[PDB]
Structures are given as structure tokens and as C-alpha cells.
Coordinates of C-alpha atoms in Angstrom, one line a residue:
Chain A
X247 CA 85.3 118.2 104.5
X248 CA 87.9 120.8 103.7
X249 CA 91.3 119.2 104.5
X250 CA 94.2 118.4 102.3
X251 CA 93.9 114.7 102.4
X252 CA 95.7 113.1 99.4
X253 CA 99.4 113.5 98.4
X254 CA 98.7 113.9 94.7
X255 CA 97.2 117.4 95.0
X256 CA 99.9 119.5 96.7
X257 CA 101.9 120.4 93.4
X258 CA 98.7 121.9 92.0
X259 CA 98.3 124.2 95.0
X260 CA 101.9 125.1 95.1
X261 CA 101.6 126.0 91.3
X262 CA 98.5 128.0 92.0
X263 CA 100.3 130.0 94.7
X264 CA 103.4 130.2 92.5
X265 CA 102.0 131.5 89.2
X266 CA 99.8 134.1 91.0
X267 CA 102.0 136.0 93.4
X268 CA 105.0 137.1 91.2
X269 CA 105.8 140.8 91.2
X270 CA 103.4 141.6 94.0
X271 CA 105.6 141.9 97.1
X272 CA 104.5 144.8 99.3
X273 CA 105.4 146.1 102.7
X274 CA 103.3 145.4 105.8
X275 CA 101.3 148.6 105.8
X276 CA 100.1 147.6 102.3
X277 CA 99.6 144.0 103.2
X278 CA 96.0 142.8 103.9
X279 CA 95.7 142.2 107.6
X280 CA 94.7 138.8 108.7
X281 CA 91.7 138.8 111.0
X282 CA 90.5 136.2 113.5
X283 CA 86.8 136.4 112.5
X284 CA 87.3 135.3 108.9
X285 CA 88.8 132.0 109.9
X286 CA 86.1 131.4 112.6
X287 CA 83.4 132.2 110.0
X288 CA 85.1 129.6 107.8
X289 CA 84.9 126.9 110.5
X290 CA 81.4 127.8 111.4
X291 CA 80.4 127.6 107.8
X292 CA 82.2 124.3 107.3
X293 CA 80.8 122.6 110.4
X294 CA 83.5 123.2 113.0
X295 CA 84.2 125.3 116.1
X296 CA 87.9 124.9 116.7
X297 CA 90.5 123.7 114.3
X298 CA 90.9 119.9 114.2
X299 CA 94.0 118.3 115.8
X300 CA 96.6 117.8 113.2
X301 CA 95.7 120.7 110.9
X302 CA 96.7 124.3 110.5
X303 CA 95.1 127.1 108.5
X304 CA 96.8 128.2 105.3
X305 CA 96.2 130.7 102.5
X306 CA 96.6 129.4 99.0
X307 CA 97.8 132.8 97.8
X308 CA 100.0 134.3 100.4
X309 CA 98.9 137.7 101.9
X310 CA 102.5 138.9 101.5
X311 CA 102.1 138.6 97.6
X312 CA 98.8 140.4 97.1
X313 CA 96.6 137.8 98.5
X314 CA 93.3 138.2 100.4
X315 CA 91.9 136.9 103.6
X316 CA 88.5 135.3 102.9
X317 CA 86.7 132.0 102.7
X318 CA 88.0 131.5 99.1
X319 CA 91.7 131.9 99.9
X320 CA 91.8 129.6 102.9
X321 CA 92.6 125.9 103.1
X322 CA 93.1 123.6 106.1
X323 CA 95.9 121.1 105.8
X324 CA 98.3 119.0 107.9
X325 CA 101.6 120.3 109.5
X326 CA 104.0 118.4 107.2
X327 CA 102.3 119.7 104.1
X328 CA 102.3 123.1 105.9
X329 CA 106.1 123.4 106.2
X330 CA 106.5 121.7 102.8
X331 CA 104.4 124.5 101.1
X332 CA 106.2 127.1 103.3
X333 CA 109.7 125.9 102.3
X334 CA 108.7 125.7 98.7
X335 CA 107.4 129.3 98.8
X336 CA 110.6 130.4 100.6
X337 CA 112.6 128.7 97.9
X338 CA 110.7 130.7 95.3
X339 CA 110.3 134.2 96.9
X340 CA 112.7 134.4 99.8
Chain B
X11 CA 142.0 155.2 133.0
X12 CA 139.8 153.9 130.2
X13 CA 136.3 154.8 129.1
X14 CA 135.2 152.1 126.7
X15 CA 136.2 149.1 124.6
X16 CA 137.9 149.9 121.3
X17 CA 135.9 150.0 118.0
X18 CA 137.8 146.9 116.7
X19 CA 138.8 144.2 119.1
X20 CA 139.0 140.5 118.4
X21 CA 140.8 137.3 119.5
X22 CA 141.9 134.1 117.8
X23 CA 141.3 130.7 119.3
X24 CA 144.1 129.1 121.4
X25 CA 142.8 125.6 120.9
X26 CA 142.8 124.5 117.2
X27 CA 141.1 121.2 116.5
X28 CA 141.7 118.9 113.5
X29 CA 138.8 117.2 111.8
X30 CA 138.0 113.6 113.0
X31 CA 138.3 110.5 110.9
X32 CA 136.7 107.0 111.3
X33 CA 138.7 103.9 111.0
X34 CA 136.9 100.6 111.7
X35 CA 139.1 97.8 113.1
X36 CA 139.1 94.9 115.6
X37 CA 139.7 95.3 119.3
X38 CA 141.9 92.2 119.8
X39 CA 144.3 93.3 117.1
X40 CA 143.9 97.1 117.2
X41 CA 147.7 97.7 116.8
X42 CA 147.9 95.8 113.6
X43 CA 145.7 97.4 111.0
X44 CA 142.8 99.7 110.3
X45 CA 140.2 99.5 107.6
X46 CA 138.5 102.5 106.2
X47 CA 134.8 103.0 106.8
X48 CA 132.6 104.8 104.3
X49 CA 129.2 106.3 104.0
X50 CA 126.7 103.9 102.6
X51 CA 123.3 104.8 101.1
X79 CA 118.9 109.4 103.2
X80 CA 122.5 108.2 103.8
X81 CA 123.8 106.1 106.8
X82 CA 127.0 104.7 108.2
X83 CA 127.3 101.2 109.7
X84 CA 130.1 98.9 110.7
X85 CA 130.9 96.0 108.4
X86 CA 130.0 92.4 109.4
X87 CA 133.6 91.3 110.2
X88 CA 134.4 94.3 112.5
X89 CA 133.6 95.2 116.0
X90 CA 135.6 98.3 116.9
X91 CA 135.6 102.0 115.8
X92 CA 138.7 104.3 116.0
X93 CA 138.7 108.1 115.9
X94 CA 141.8 110.1 115.2
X95 CA 142.2 113.8 115.6
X96 CA 144.7 116.4 117.0
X97 CA 144.8 119.7 118.9
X98 CA 147.2 122.7 118.5
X99 CA 147.8 124.8 121.7
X100 CA 149.0 128.4 121.4
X101 CA 150.0 131.0 124.1
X102 CA 147.2 133.3 125.2
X103 CA 149.3 136.5 125.2
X104 CA 150.3 136.1 121.5
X105 CA 146.8 135.2 120.4
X106 CA 145.0 138.5 120.0
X107 CA 144.4 139.4 116.4
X108 CA 143.2 143.0 116.3
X109 CA 142.9 145.7 119.0
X110 CA 142.8 149.4 118.1
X111 CA 143.9 150.7 121.4
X112 CA 147.4 150.5 122.9
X113 CA 146.1 151.3 126.4
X114 CA 143.6 148.5 126.2
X115 CA 146.2 146.1 124.9
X116 CA 148.5 146.9 127.8
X117 CA 145.7 146.5 130.3
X118 CA 144.8 143.1 128.9
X119 CA 148.5 142.2 129.0
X120 CA 148.9 143.1 132.6
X121 CA 145.7 141.4 133.6
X122 CA 146.8 138.2 131.8
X123 CA 150.2 138.4 133.6
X124 CA 148.5 138.8 136.9
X125 CA 146.4 135.7 136.3
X126 CA 149.6 133.8 135.3
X127 CA 151.2 135.0 138.6
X128 CA 148.1 134.0 140.7
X129 CA 146.8 130.8 139.0
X130 CA 149.1 129.9 136.1
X131 CA 146.4 128.6 133.8
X132 CA 146.4 125.2 135.6
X133 CA 142.8 124.8 136.5
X134 CA 141.6 125.3 132.8
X135 CA 144.3 122.9 131.6
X136 CA 143.1 120.3 134.1
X137 CA 139.5 120.7 133.0
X138 CA 140.3 120.4 129.3
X139 CA 142.4 117.3 129.9
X140 CA 139.6 115.9 132.0
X141 CA 137.1 116.5 129.2
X142 CA 139.5 114.6 126.8
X143 CA 140.0 111.8 129.3
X144 CA 136.3 111.0 129.8
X145 CA 135.7 110.8 126.0
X146 CA 133.0 113.4 125.9
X147 CA 133.8 114.1 122.2
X148 CA 132.2 110.7 121.2
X149 CA 128.7 112.4 121.6
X150 CA 126.0 109.8 120.7
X151 CA 128.6 107.0 120.1
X152 CA 129.6 107.2 123.8
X153 CA 126.2 105.8 124.9
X154 CA 126.0 102.0 124.9
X155 CA 129.7 101.3 124.4
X156 CA 131.2 98.1 125.9
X157 CA 134.8 99.3 126.1
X158 CA 136.2 102.8 125.5
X159 CA 139.9 103.5 125.4
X160 CA 141.8 106.8 124.8
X161 CA 145.5 107.2 124.1
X162 CA 147.2 110.6 124.2
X163 CA 150.4 111.1 122.1
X164 CA 152.7 114.0 122.8
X165 CA 155.3 115.2 120.2
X166 CA 157.4 112.1 120.7
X167 CA 156.2 110.2 123.8
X168 CA 152.9 108.6 124.5
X169 CA 150.9 108.4 127.7
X170 CA 149.2 105.4 129.3
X171 CA 145.7 104.4 128.1
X172 CA 142.5 106.1 129.5
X173 CA 139.6 104.0 130.7
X174 CA 136.8 106.5 129.9
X175 CA 134.1 104.3 131.3
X176 CA 135.2 105.1 134.9
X177 CA 135.0 108.9 134.4
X178 CA 131.6 110.6 134.7
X179 CA 130.4 113.7 133.0
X180 CA 129.7 115.6 136.1
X181 CA 132.7 115.6 138.5
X182 CA 136.3 116.6 137.6
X183 CA 139.2 114.4 138.8
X184 CA 142.2 116.4 139.9
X185 CA 144.3 113.4 141.1
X186 CA 145.5 111.3 138.1
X187 CA 149.2 111.5 137.4
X188 CA 148.9 111.5 133.6
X189 CA 146.1 114.1 133.8
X190 CA 148.5 116.2 135.9
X191 CA 151.3 115.9 133.5
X192 CA 149.4 116.8 130.4
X193 CA 147.7 119.6 132.2
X194 CA 151.1 121.0 133.2
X195 CA 152.4 120.8 129.7
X196 CA 149.2 122.5 128.4
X197 CA 149.3 125.3 131.1
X198 CA 153.0 125.9 130.3
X199 CA 152.3 126.3 126.5
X200 CA 149.4 128.5 127.6
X201 CA 151.0 131.1 129.8
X202 CA 154.5 131.9 128.5
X203 CA 156.7 128.9 128.5
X204 CA 156.4 127.1 125.2
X205 CA 155.3 128.6 121.9
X206 CA 153.3 125.7 120.5
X207 CA 152.0 122.3 121.4
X208 CA 150.5 119.5 119.2
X209 CA 148.6 116.7 120.8
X210 CA 147.3 113.6 118.9
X211 CA 144.4 111.7 120.2
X212 CA 143.3 108.2 119.1
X213 CA 140.2 106.4 120.4
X214 CA 138.9 102.9 120.5
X215 CA 135.2 102.2 121.1
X216 CA 133.9 98.6 121.0
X217 CA 130.3 99.1 119.9
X218 CA 129.9 95.5 118.7
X219 CA 129.8 93.6 115.3
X220 CA 127.6 95.2 112.6
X221 CA 126.4 98.3 114.6
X222 CA 125.6 101.8 113.6
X223 CA 127.7 104.9 114.2
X224 CA 126.7 108.6 114.0
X225 CA 129.1 111.0 112.2
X226 CA 128.5 114.7 111.7
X227 CA 125.6 115.9 109.5
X228 CA 125.7 118.4 106.7
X229 CA 123.7 121.6 106.9
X230 CA 122.2 121.2 103.5
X231 CA 121.0 124.3 101.5
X232 CA 119.4 122.7 98.5
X233 CA 115.6 122.7 98.7
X234 CA 114.9 119.9 96.2
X235 CA 115.7 117.1 98.7
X236 CA 115.9 117.2 102.6
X237 CA 117.5 113.8 103.1
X238 CA 120.1 113.3 105.8
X239 CA 123.6 114.0 104.6
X240 CA 126.6 112.7 106.6
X241 CA 130.2 114.0 106.6
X242 CA 132.8 112.6 104.3
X243 CA 136.5 113.4 105.2
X244 CA 139.1 112.0 102.7
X245 CA 136.5 109.4 101.6
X246 CA 135.9 108.0 105.1
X247 CA 133.5 109.4 107.8
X248 CA 134.1 111.6 110.7
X249 CA 132.9 114.6 112.8
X250 CA 133.5 118.3 112.3
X251 CA 136.1 120.1 114.2
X252 CA 133.4 122.3 115.7
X253 CA 131.6 119.4 117.3
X254 CA 134.8 118.2 119.1
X255 CA 135.7 121.8 120.1
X256 CA 132.2 122.2 121.6
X257 CA 132.5 118.9 123.4
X258 CA 135.9 119.9 124.9
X259 CA 134.8 123.4 125.7
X260 CA 132.1 122.2 128.2
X261 CA 133.9 122.8 131.5
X262 CA 132.0 125.9 132.7
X263 CA 130.4 125.2 136.1
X264 CA 130.9 128.7 137.7
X265 CA 127.5 130.0 136.7
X266 CA 124.6 131.3 138.7
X267 CA 122.0 128.7 139.9
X268 CA 124.6 125.9 139.5
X269 CA 123.1 124.0 142.5
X270 CA 119.7 124.1 140.8
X271 CA 121.0 122.4 137.6
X272 CA 124.3 120.7 138.5
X273 CA 125.8 120.1 135.0
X274 CA 128.6 121.8 133.2
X275 CA 127.8 123.9 130.2
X276 CA 129.9 125.1 127.2
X277 CA 131.5 128.5 127.3
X278 CA 129.5 131.1 125.3
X279 CA 129.1 134.8 125.8
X280 CA 125.6 134.8 127.4
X281 CA 126.0 131.3 128.9
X282 CA 123.7 129.9 126.3
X283 CA 123.1 126.2 125.6
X284 CA 120.5 124.1 123.7
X285 CA 119.4 121.4 126.2
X286 CA 117.5 123.9 128.3
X287 CA 117.1 126.7 126.0
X288 CA 117.8 129.3 128.6
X289 CA 120.3 132.3 128.6
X290 CA 122.1 131.2 131.8
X291 CA 123.9 134.6 131.9
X292 CA 121.4 137.3 130.8
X293 CA 122.7 139.8 133.3
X294 CA 125.8 141.3 135.0
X295 CA 127.3 137.8 135.1
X296 CA 127.7 137.9 131.3
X297 CA 131.2 138.3 129.8
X298 CA 130.6 141.9 128.6
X299 CA 129.8 143.2 132.0
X300 CA 132.6 141.2 133.5
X301 CA 135.1 142.6 131.1
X302 CA 133.8 146.1 131.8
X303 CA 134.1 145.6 135.6
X304 CA 137.5 144.1 135.0
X305 CA 139.2 146.6 132.7
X306 CA 137.2 149.8 132.6
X307 CA 136.9 150.2 136.4
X308 CA 139.8 148.0 137.4
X309 CA 137.5 146.5 140.0
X310 CA 138.8 143.2 141.6
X311 CA 136.9 140.0 140.7
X312 CA 136.4 136.6 142.3
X313 CA 138.6 133.8 141.1
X314 CA 135.5 132.2 139.4
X315 CA 135.0 135.2 137.2
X316 CA 138.6 135.3 136.4
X317 CA 138.5 131.6 135.4
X318 CA 135.4 132.3 133.2
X319 CA 137.0 135.3 131.5
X320 CA 140.2 133.4 130.9
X321 CA 138.2 130.5 129.4
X322 CA 136.4 133.0 127.1
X323 CA 139.7 134.5 126.0
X324 CA 141.1 131.0 125.3
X325 CA 138.1 130.2 123.2
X326 CA 138.4 133.4 121.2
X327 CA 135.9 135.4 119.3
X328 CA 135.0 138.9 118.3
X329 CA 134.2 141.6 121.0
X330 CA 133.5 145.0 119.4
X331 CA 131.7 148.0 120.6
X332 CA 128.6 149.3 118.9
Chain C
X1 CA 99.1 105.0 144.4
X2 CA 102.9 104.9 145.2
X3 CA 105.1 106.7 142.7
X4 CA 108.8 106.5 141.7
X5 CA 110.5 109.3 139.7
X6 CA 113.2 109.1 137.2
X7 CA 115.0 112.0 135.6
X8 CA 116.9 112.3 132.3
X9 CA 120.1 114.2 133.0
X10 CA 120.3 117.3 130.7
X11 CA 123.5 118.4 129.1
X12 CA 124.6 115.0 127.6
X13 CA 123.9 116.0 124.0
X14 CA 121.6 113.0 123.4
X15 CA 117.9 113.9 123.2
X16 CA 115.8 112.3 125.9
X17 CA 113.6 110.4 123.5
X18 CA 116.5 108.2 122.5
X19 CA 117.4 107.4 126.1
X20 CA 113.7 106.7 126.9
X21 CA 113.2 104.3 123.9
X22 CA 116.7 102.7 124.1
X23 CA 117.4 101.6 127.7
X24 CA 114.4 102.6 129.8
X25 CA 111.3 101.4 128.0
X26 CA 112.6 97.9 127.1
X27 CA 113.8 97.1 130.6
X28 CA 110.7 98.6 132.1
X29 CA 108.6 96.4 129.9
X30 CA 110.8 93.4 130.9
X31 CA 110.1 93.9 134.6
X32 CA 106.5 94.8 133.9
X33 CA 105.8 91.4 132.3
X34 CA 108.0 89.8 134.9
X35 CA 106.1 91.3 137.8
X36 CA 102.6 90.2 136.5
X37 CA 100.8 93.5 135.4
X38 CA 100.8 95.8 138.5
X39 CA 102.5 98.9 137.2
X40 CA 101.9 102.0 135.1
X41 CA 103.9 104.8 133.4
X42 CA 103.2 108.6 133.4
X43 CA 105.1 111.5 132.0
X44 CA 104.8 114.6 134.3
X45 CA 106.1 117.0 131.6
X46 CA 103.6 116.7 128.7
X47 CA 102.8 119.9 126.8
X48 CA 100.7 119.8 123.7
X49 CA 100.8 122.7 121.2
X50 CA 101.5 121.0 117.9
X51 CA 103.0 117.6 118.7
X52 CA 104.0 115.3 121.6
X53 CA 106.4 116.8 124.2
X54 CA 107.0 113.8 126.5
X55 CA 109.8 115.8 128.1
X56 CA 112.3 115.0 130.8
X57 CA 110.6 113.5 133.9
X58 CA 109.2 110.0 134.0
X59 CA 107.3 108.3 136.7
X60 CA 106.3 104.6 137.4
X61 CA 103.2 104.1 139.6
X62 CA 102.0 101.1 141.5
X63 CA 99.1 100.3 143.8
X64 CA 101.4 98.7 146.4
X65 CA 104.7 99.9 148.0
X66 CA 106.3 96.5 148.4
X67 CA 105.8 95.9 144.7
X68 CA 107.9 99.0 144.0
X69 CA 110.4 97.9 146.6
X70 CA 110.7 94.4 144.9
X71 CA 111.1 96.1 141.5
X72 CA 114.6 97.2 142.5
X73 CA 115.3 99.7 139.8
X74 CA 118.6 100.7 141.4
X75 CA 120.5 97.6 140.4
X76 CA 118.8 97.1 137.1
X77 CA 119.5 100.6 135.9
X78 CA 123.0 100.7 137.4
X79 CA 124.6 100.9 133.9
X80 CA 123.5 104.3 132.4
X81 CA 123.8 106.1 135.7
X82 CA 125.6 109.0 134.0
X83 CA 122.5 109.6 131.8
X84 CA 119.6 108.9 134.1
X85 CA 118.9 109.6 137.8
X86 CA 116.9 107.3 140.0
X87 CA 115.8 108.5 143.5
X88 CA 115.0 106.0 146.3
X89 CA 112.3 108.3 147.7
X90 CA 109.1 106.4 146.9
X91 CA 106.3 108.5 148.5
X92 CA 102.5 108.8 148.2
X93 CA 101.0 111.2 145.7
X94 CA 97.4 112.0 144.8
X95 CA 97.8 114.3 141.6
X96 CA 98.7 111.8 138.9
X97 CA 97.7 111.9 135.3
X98 CA 97.4 108.7 133.4
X99 CA 98.1 108.0 129.7
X100 CA 96.2 105.8 127.3
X101 CA 97.6 104.2 124.1
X102 CA 95.8 105.2 120.8
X103 CA 96.0 102.9 117.9
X104 CA 97.4 103.7 114.4
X105 CA 96.3 102.3 111.1
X106 CA 98.3 100.0 108.8
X107 CA 99.4 101.0 105.4
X108 CA 98.0 100.1 102.0
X109 CA 99.5 96.6 101.6
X110 CA 98.6 95.0 104.9
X111 CA 95.1 96.4 104.9
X112 CA 94.6 95.2 101.3
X113 CA 95.8 91.7 102.2
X114 CA 93.5 91.6 105.2
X115 CA 90.6 92.7 103.0
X116 CA 91.4 90.1 100.4
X117 CA 91.5 87.4 103.1
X118 CA 88.2 88.7 104.5
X119 CA 85.0 89.6 102.6
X120 CA 86.8 91.7 100.0
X121 CA 84.7 94.6 98.8
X122 CA 87.7 96.0 96.7
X123 CA 87.1 99.8 97.0
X124 CA 90.8 100.3 96.1
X125 CA 90.7 104.0 95.1
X126 CA 89.2 105.6 98.3
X127 CA 90.2 103.0 100.9
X128 CA 93.6 104.6 101.7
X129 CA 91.8 107.9 102.1
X130 CA 89.7 106.4 104.9
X131 CA 92.9 105.4 106.8
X132 CA 95.0 108.5 105.8
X133 CA 92.7 110.9 107.5
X134 CA 92.9 108.9 110.7
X135 CA 96.7 108.8 110.4
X136 CA 96.7 112.6 110.1
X137 CA 95.7 112.7 113.8
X138 CA 97.8 109.7 115.1
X139 CA 100.9 111.3 113.5
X140 CA 100.7 114.4 115.8
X141 CA 101.0 112.6 119.2
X142 CA 103.8 111.6 121.5
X143 CA 105.3 108.2 120.6
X144 CA 107.9 105.7 121.6
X145 CA 109.9 103.4 119.3
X146 CA 110.4 99.8 120.3
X147 CA 112.0 96.7 118.8
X148 CA 109.7 93.8 119.2
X149 CA 111.8 90.8 120.4
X150 CA 109.0 88.2 119.9
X151 CA 108.0 89.2 116.4
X152 CA 111.2 90.9 115.1
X153 CA 109.9 94.3 113.9
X154 CA 109.7 97.9 115.2
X155 CA 106.8 100.3 115.6
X156 CA 105.8 103.7 116.9
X157 CA 103.6 103.3 120.0
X158 CA 101.5 106.4 120.5
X159 CA 100.0 107.7 123.7
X160 CA 97.8 110.5 125.0
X161 CA 96.6 111.6 128.4
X162 CA 93.2 110.5 129.8
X163 CA 90.9 111.4 132.6
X164 CA 90.5 107.9 134.0
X165 CA 92.2 107.3 137.3
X166 CA 92.1 103.4 137.9
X167 CA 91.9 100.2 136.0
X168 CA 94.4 97.6 134.7
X169 CA 96.7 99.6 132.6
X170 CA 98.6 97.3 130.2
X171 CA 101.6 95.0 130.1
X172 CA 103.5 98.0 128.6
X173 CA 102.6 100.3 131.6
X174 CA 100.5 102.5 129.3
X175 CA 96.7 102.3 129.0

């Protein structure tokens, strides 16, 4: 029901965020602005009202590298996987 | 009459600390031998089966405060600092700070986690040739400072004399003996790893054996500062930073005109007299050393 | 509901969790089993934003006052006095919050062995999934490590606040 549940899928997501955001770094005024209504629409579509305990929202393609804020570019996942993907992306980009 | 701090002012530390080293041994025959203790593999470090004592060896170099300023691009500021330091020597004589540092050594605060749950702790201080009687660190708490021990008084007197103007250098060698127990676990320093492939715990290897950094022992010894606002609310000594910062509370204890910068402004720029607590704090900061430059 | 308050002294370098799970929880458990199930434990510092934040203050609660008097925490804890602070001012309070233990789920091997012993339905591929989801909640709660003397192993006892006010808590002081 829309949560990163198995270990053996994270490298695919890191790859997808890796081979799609190269050479797309832009300043904040060119970045797409994250809105609070898109995520709420995502939960409401996916049968939720508030985020479940133990999960944090995450964009597969980062907004800092030309991503978009929508239902497509949005995945819910645990905290440990969250900082794992965050540190992997920091290792790649900055 | 001065207007501002110089564009390039800095100080060098007057308390140099050697890196620690771990030497596992036996308590009943501690003055006979010492076996090396190595990191075993996420790494770890534990005592061997036929061993029940851990020994830490390190040293401290003490230098005079006056001849310990590295750069200062103002002769007037240099002379002002010199006369203020001489006034402090005339009034106090750097004795309170020396007693506090010796007290921090005597209670074995530098053991950090290894202090907790220790059956017997012994500390022996060795001056250039002579040695001093052993310290029973289990009887010294981490809150009150004892100003009555004879050995503490002697070592503090020597340190104060080396501080103000009397002697040009001092070297103090410290050995420790902690009786954790047979086949226990010790906690050396941890590397701040930068490689992103693995994030396993990395311990500190010094000449093959284990030990702590010099910064950890220096931070342990530096914790003498009690003359800070709201001391009665908290009632624990903190280390000596610029804005009184720490990490167990996460609060900038001196975010205001009690900070070192405002104190040095009111001490040098305006020549305003200060209480003895502020003078003690500013001498402690000067002993610690650092960089203090204008914007 | 008489209460007794213990404080972890800050500025000693050691994190409060180690002191709680090293020489407070085991001795508290020892006198709890020794004094036949009449005490509870609460943590008046819990904040919850992303994980458990058990904090600094701890409190032991009892229905009676003579029970807390006969507990005699002063002499039993008179060895780590430079790290903990115990106050002999048992008063009466009426604003307590109780904590209940939540149960984790065992890993692949133990669950698989239990399933083979029982009416094995051998759904090997998605079985771990069924537990892992549950673990993804029980892994963001406050917990305490404890070395089990009777069995010889160690675990990660989790806890979370609850709205109930009375009842027989546990032998561990939790609920």
C-alpha cells in the first residue's frame, strides 16, 4: 500500500534517481516548489489522512535536480532508508 | 586608548596533551609488565581472558601564558594584554586555575565512559624526575573541587609557577590503572570516517594499540568552568568555549554580554574593571588558546 | 499514587540511555520482583517527533507510601551517586502518564522454526514481509536494552505511552 517494504528494491530507486538528475542542478528560484496539498492528495488517494508512524515522504527524482512534485514522483519509506538514500545522493551530487 | 581588536589576533594553547595509549595488565603485578591491547574485528576492543586491568599513559606540556601569543597586529593591544596579564599575576598568580586542572586530573575525568563501573581507579603523576603519591579517584566526585590535598597543592603550585613567569616549560607524565574486570570491554576514541561505502564503527589505533585522541583528554581536563550564569539552576561544571556551549544540554550558556568577546571588549577597549570570576574565565580562555579576529 | 523521582546528572559525558539500561533498570527489576508486583515506571520527559526520546527524568510510582519507604532506593543506589540523583521527597501527584510495552516480532529463523513445529503452511517468500512491516513501526519507539539473567540473552524492550490510569502494570514496572 505504497511503502518501501523490502530491502532488495532500494538500489533500483537510487539508480533511478541517479541516472536522471545529472547536469540539472538549478538555484532555488528555478527549483519547483514543494506544496503541502500534493502530498495530502497523495495520501487521500492512497487511503490515508496523516503519514503512518515510521515513514517519511520522499521524491524519487530530487526537486533540486529538475524533479517535479506530483503523485508520480513521490514514495513513502522508512527513516533508515530515508537517510540511506539521502547520504547516497549526497555522495553523488554534493 | 583603543577602539577595536586588531585584524589578526590569535593565541596558542598553553596545555599540550599527548595522545593516549592502552596497555592491558594485571592489578596485583602492575609494576612488572604490560601487554599491548589491539583493536579486534564494525570493530571493537575487549580485554583478553587472562587480564583484569587497563592502563592509560599520556603526558602534558605546560608553557607560560605571556610567551604564548602567536600573532597580534597591534603593539598597543599587545602591551595592554601584557599589563592585564601581569596584573592578574600580581593579584591571583594563576593558582585557582592550576588547582582546578590538577583536580580534574586527580578525579580521572579523562577516562570518560571507562570511568563508570570501575572497581578500582588509581592515578600516579610523575614530574620531571620525582613521582607523587597515588590518587584514589573513586573518592573524588565530578561536582566539587577539593582545595586541601597536599599533593594537589604542590602540583598546582608548580603548574602556576610555569604558567605566570617562573619556569619556561613543564612536562607531566600521567599513568592510570582501572580494574574493570577479567574479559571486559573498553571504549577507545572513534574515527570520524569520510568514506560513504561503509559506515561501520572505526576505533583509534595508536602505534598498533588503542587509545584516545588528545582532543578528548584536553576537553575532559578543560571542564572546570563553574562561573557562568544560572549556575545554581544547573550545578555542573562545563568546558571552556567562547559562547559557553556544550552538548549535554544543547544550550549556548553565554549568548550575551557574558560571552568572551564582550568580556574582552569591556576589559581592554574600555579598561573597565571586572569581577574576579570574569578574570578567571578570561584567563582560562587565554590558557586554552584559539583565534580571536575582528570581522 | 505516590511517586519517587530520579534524575540523571547531565555533563558526565555518558548518554542517559546507557545509565538507565546499565545500573537503574536491572536493580529496579530486582526489587520489583522482590517486592511482589506493586510498582510502575514512568518517564516525565517523553517527546515524540521521529523516535523515542525517553530523556532525563525517571519516576517510580506505587499505590502505597510504606511500600516506597520499604523499597529503600537510597542504599541500593549508593554506588553511582556521582551519575544519578535520588530525592527523599516522596509526595502525592495526580498528573501521571503511564507507559505500556509493545511487542516486537522475531526474525526469519525463529518464526520459520515455530511455523515448522506448528501447522506449517510454508509461505516462505512473503512471510518476512508480513513481519517486516510491523517491525517498521516497532523500530521507531523508545526502548531499553536488558541482559536476561534467567535465559542468557539480550533484547530491546520497547514502550509507548497509554491513556489508562490503573491496573497491574508488570513485573518490569512497564505495562
